[PDB]
Design a binder for this molecule. Structure first.
Ligand SMILES: C[S@@+](CC[C@H](N)C(=O)[O-])C[C@H]1O[C@@H](n2cnc3c(N)ncnc32)[C@H](O)[C@@H]1O
Ligand SMILES: C[S@@+](CC[C@H](N)C(=O)[O-])C[C@H]1O[C@@H](n2cnc3c(N)ncnc32)[C@H](O)[C@@H]1O
Ligand SMILES: [Br-]
Ligand SMILES: [Br-]
Ligand SMILES: [Br-]
Lengths: 257, 265
């Protein structure tokens, strides 16, 4: 092999090695131009990313991606809380249009209905999907967030927005033991995958629609995919591969029998 | 896991196993139901590539998968032999040709390949792995206007293939008896590798020493649940090449088609 992206990735990584949310946006663009390149097939993608010589470069890019991701969420959270026009400020979040698309295809993958009960594991500072489950899909939502200070901030976001029927529970994935719900979603950044799915397995039954977010193809450059082994005791029952600028693949699983 | 498909597949293989016990020689008419059960699993678009490998790479499935794969190649090769001899005896060769079970699939597959590899009338193609019914090289010439060499390692199979070509009055399709190393001695614009050309590792290593970095190369492989039918070409098999376009099949087409160029130096 001799893919032109091999060198391009290596070069972007050289500029992260020694390393302002606004001022690093062009780095994101460079990385996403490659991730989103639809001429790169899943075999090619895997050839680049699975290669031992690519190991360090992959880790630099992934580190950058989750860091900018988090910082953009933080910043927006606070912005939303301080805003006279919170829903307008929410709408201008860099990733907003993407999340709409994503949750739009998940709603179909998961047959979402008004009044169903959704649980969302890993809400973060800006619980946007939580918010959209209720605001758009009219579901009754519990968002779960492990870090108390982030959970506290996420409540101030929900409250600032005046969204109804979205509550934030401070805790790990085992808080699902005392909940009743129709749909369970697992955030892309919900970690650690192996423990998270072992525990989910304990507290759902075979009818619970479970949706998780992962990364497939060239988009795996952004984050480590949920493995086969991670979803032991489940079966896949539908997948949505992304297009456009949407980065996550959404997978629907059911607990085995 | 707990895919419905797992037991389906196990029962199919059980039937194959009991049948191979009774008869070495396939009864091609008699086994069509079984192909169709296998193709309904292969063609199910509800199954994603990730699950397909969950299913198909499990060590517990290896015995069943091998029996299904041996069936698919043994059936397709017998169907080819039967059709070839029919064509040769027929007073309506084209009509006979057209009734070959997989015929419509090949027209659809070749079309997508024609766009993928930008086939132009007059260009020289070489097809490795011709078989008794050299449908792909026949179409390259009759439909696509290419000047074709078909390579077939088995001399009696190459022989039968020439006779089919003649029977059909097809010009510009020559048949070489040899292995993939005959391509050193040939000029070609495009090179194509039958999904059944074996062994992959050797074939692609000989391709590598005998082509340049400009020559279009197209091979047929199996992806998703269609990999139930035959072992795919691995990324290790194509070291020293880069992928430059893939055509994922729909409908009843079995083959994925991949374009590659040899790497620089
Ligand atoms: C996943 S993101 C935000 C989620 C998603 N981007 C959204 O807001 O629509 C980051 C958060 O998930 C939380 N998290 C990761 N693993 C968790 C688990 N097992 N249980 C509860 N929260 C978790 C982290 O504290 C982090 O703030
Ligand atoms: C590949 S199939 C036929 C393909 C199909 N008949 C078509 O036209 O598209 C049959 C042949 O490939 C031949 N074959 C397998 N490996 C080969 C190789 N490395 N070189 C030349 N022939 C090969 C086998 O002997 C077998 O007859
Ligand atoms: Br820079
Ligand atoms: Br592919
Ligand atoms: Br005729």
């Amino acid at each position: 092999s001799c893919y032109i992206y091999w060198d391009k990735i290596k070069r972007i990584a050289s500029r992260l090695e020694g390393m302002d949310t606004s001022g690093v946006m062009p780095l994101l663009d460079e990385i996403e131009e490659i991730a989103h390149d639809s001429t790169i097939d899943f075999e090619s993608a895997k050839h680049i990313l699975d290669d031992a010589e690519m190991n360090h470069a992959l880790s630099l890019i992934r580190k950058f991606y989750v860091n900018l991701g988090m910082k953009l969420q933080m910043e927006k959270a606070q912005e939303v809380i301080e805003s006279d026009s919170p829903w307008e400020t929410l709408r201008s979040f860099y990733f907003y249009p993407r999340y709409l698309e994503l949750l739009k295809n998940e709603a179909a993958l998961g047959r979402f209905r008004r009044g169903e009960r959704a649980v969302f594991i890993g809400g973060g500072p800006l619980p946007l999907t939580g918010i959209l489950l209720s605001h758009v899909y009219g579901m009754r939502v519990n968002v779960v967030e492990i870090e108390p200070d982030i959970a506290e901030l996420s409540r101030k976001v929900i409250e600032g927005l005046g969204v109804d029927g979205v509550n934030v529970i401070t805790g790990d994935e085992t808080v699902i033991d005392g909940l009743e719900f129709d749909v369970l979603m697992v955030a892309a950044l919900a970690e650690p995958k192996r423990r998270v799915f072992r525990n989910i397995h304990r507290y759902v039954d075979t009818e619970t629609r479970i949706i998780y977010r992962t990364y497939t193809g060239m988009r795996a450059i952004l984050y480590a995919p949920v493995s086969d082994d991670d979803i032991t005791g489940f079966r896949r029952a539908g997948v949505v591969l992304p297009s456009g600028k949407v980065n996550n693949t959404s997978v629907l699983v059911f607990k085995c029998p």
